[PDB]
């Protein structure tokens, strides 16, 4: 009969239940427990494992380069940013408010760290997330258009609830491809948030994309409903370098 | 806590477990046997329900017009066929032996009834089964060819473990399309069984397909490893008509 | 030290040597012959295993549906073909002589069986072989041409030393596509032998291709240097069927 | 039988084993040796030869102009650098720590020699290495991008475990292409070490690349995990010139 139980558990797609079937049976035998409570505990454990696996798969599908979280963020080293606003962002209210989040400032101040923290929080709460750099997004859209399948890649970049665009400005974009970025900003306008991190001021975006009018349209769509953070302070990388030296 | 159990059962894709959770819990409380045996009974009931649903889905996907069984076949009305051979067929040994089944004889003698019985038995033991008429098969193959997707339809007609070709001979096949049939008979040769029901003897197949050489090739391929039944006797439809009149 | 031996054997890409290292060492210790002879035996076994793996890979790339050999061929049941000629073919002299091999006769007389025997014999002696049906070859060439990459598939059909074309005559080839076959016959003309199995006489090939001039050109190119076999006798499939019944 | 052994050894891609086959056979015959130990010795010698050839091939693939090592470096002539730190670097702990190595100072003080020594040490221990000058790297990346194959060259520059950038500052980089260099620093950041030699201070990097912001970002990414050596003293080339004159 035990083998039949194992076979049924494996057939109903309950591997962890089969693995822990003996342990839970021993626990129920040693200590008197109602059947309802036993089943509730077993199903809750199975659901916990399923949710953990789902979160891991989501993190795999979001192409996050290095998992980070706000818990490791030292606001003492970055007094230029009000931690209250960051905590408000972590509420994920902007997702329902359809508001983008624009991080700005010098290199190595936590812009990418904060963006990845927000993306990780969104993933934890079940919000589909996708992380990518501006150069990579533009190149992928250009390649998809060259292959006559731009719509598929546009759906790929528009479906995620939270799209993170990292390092918008370090590498100048090819003007002929700049419009691709606009399309995303145009298709996620009042549909989904965009978490965009950059070191360039808005007025310089025309240089980045090589089209002043297109840059102005992109900025109008992106800044219509968004939260703009202008971070400042010394680079954290240099801080760690000095600490190691000292 | 019970609502949590219901939600978990719904999330685990076990609707019947959620539906019958209360009844089984009450039975276990009133009658205490064991936690292991209680879970065994629950999972066995769930497996039975899932198996029934899968069988129904297979029947729906097998394009069987009506559902028959060997139980309803009265061998007293058709003494010309030995029931022993039919029972041997019902063991589905021909599936492993790659043997084809051919039913021949006048109309209304149970050829299609036996073919559908064999198909239903094959579906019962989990073997994929498909049923189609020769005229419809040829027409669908021609239409797929005209639209440049003959390969997809050929895969559809070759995937099933047991393919039943019914009423091959009442309607003469289009000479420009009869070759399509051969292709199927060529692709399933020594790979999957074919259950073909017809009233025309083998020597007459040349008339049906409009090509003596193609007919001979088809017959040699189909009759290599095959069980040929030449049923006889008066039509059963007329027997029922006489019984109703009398 | 033995672990180092295992690691070195794995690094040199000799898995079988590492796996059988213990057995050969035990044999050498129990039975002493010579270091040179021990290494000779080890290397002979390794070469045999490598040759077997290479033959398996070639068969994977040779597209041989079922493996047959001349040993299982019963010339007593097929006296219409002189076994001496088949043995002469087994020498593979036609490969150097640039001579094709054409089999003709009624269905189910061993034509495909002999063609696959020749193909397997060629594969054994390191010759590249590729087996295909005429209809499938024509379909693949047409699809490649429609994709603008016909020459790639043409090379794929031309690269193998021995190309076997089966079922030429049972299905009429598309007149708009039969020329593709001609191209192969043109490209392998006195370049690499072709083993073609068919049931139609040469004069009828026009009906197969729908063009008398094209059929005549194909016949002239194929028969310029070839060995023609005209087999006769009852189909062996029907003989096996009668034996099973009797 | 000896010819068979030689043929098998050559087929199994063991040239040196066959070359020394007679010598090893004579050594085994003259002095009694267990077969296991004899095979261990033979495989060890083959592995040593393979390792030497692999190291030489890696040296050829990595464009090192002249081969040097630490043993040839005279710390007495360059007291400005502590030998202890160089020896610590030779342990290759930075590879596990993802720490870069920057050499700075006047020309001809051994920066290139030390970089080549570290690269050779990395190659010897089996770590993939690559050497190039900054101008050459920038030009190659620009040419690859102009051909629409920037990703392939980026992989080429990122795949090596230890990348050496020699003479970063002697030749000013084209402002339109400086970003290419950043890409490498952007992709090798926290992934693989970089050994960079320069005669320019960090504050002047903006002049080298012609973009203050890009230079600052490159420096922040490079110095996050790095070991910086400020070498001083007279030029070694001038020292040799004076010694030859005197
Ligand atoms: N306040 C901080 N607390 C903890 N880690 C930090 C902080 N600021 C930066 N870091 C770490 O420093 C490194 C660089 O910071 P980060 O990538 O977030 O900066 P950035 O603004 O995105 O930089 P860039 O412009 O170079 O892309 C990362 O490891 C990041 O985790
Ligand atoms: N011996 C029998 N017992 C029970 N039902 C029978 C029997 N013979 C025939 N029938 C029923 O009579 C009807 C006609 O029989 P069936 O369709 O199997 O005959 P057939 O020879 O395949 O017909 P056709 O040539 O018209 O396709 C069906 O309902 C079949 O179930
Ligand atoms: N002489 C024989 N000895 C053994 N088996 C045979 C012999 N002749 C035919 N067979 C078997 O009969 C079956 C059909 O024969 P084969 O595969 O050679 O096809 P074929 O006659 O070339 O077919 P077609 O004319 O349709 O192309 C195969 O199982 C083959 O092994
Ligand atoms: N301490 C030393 N011991 C041995 N050889 C040395 C030493 N210093 C320099 N050399 C040799 O002097 C020549 C030039 O030195 P090297 O290229 O290493 O210096 P550098 O500072 O990188 O030069 P530059 O900036 O002019 O290109 C090379 O042959 C190097 O091997
Ligand atoms: Mg960043
Ligand atoms: Mg019927
Ligand atoms: Mg054949
Ligand atoms: Mg130098």
Residue numbers in the entry:
A (entry chain C), B (entry chain D), C (entry chain B), D (entry chain A): 1 to 246
List sentences quoted exactly from the publication behind this structure.
Using IS21 as a model transposase system, we show how an ATPase regulator uses nucleotide-controlled assembly and DNA deformation to enable structure-based site selectivity, transposase recruitment, and activation and integration. IstB, similar to the MuB and TnsC helper proteins, is a member of the AAA+ family and a close paralogue of the DnaC/I helicase loader. However, this tetramer state is inactive and requires the regulatory IstB factor to perform transposition.
In the IstB decamer, eight out of the ten nucleotide-binding sites adopt a canonical AAA+ ATPase configuration. Close inspection of the EM map showed clear density maps for ATP in all binding pockets. Exceptions were the two terminal monomers where the nucleotide-binding sites are solvent exposed (the outer dimers are also more flexible). Close inspection of the complex revealed the presence of numerous positively charged residues that interact with the target DNA, which partially explained the 30-fold increase in duplex affinity observed for the full-length protein compared with the isolated ATPase module (Kd,app of 40 nM versus 1.5 µM, respectively). These amino acids, together with a conserved region of the AAA+ domains known as the initiator-specific motif, form an internal cavity within each IstB dimer that engages DNA primarily through nonspecific contacts to the phosphodiester backbone.
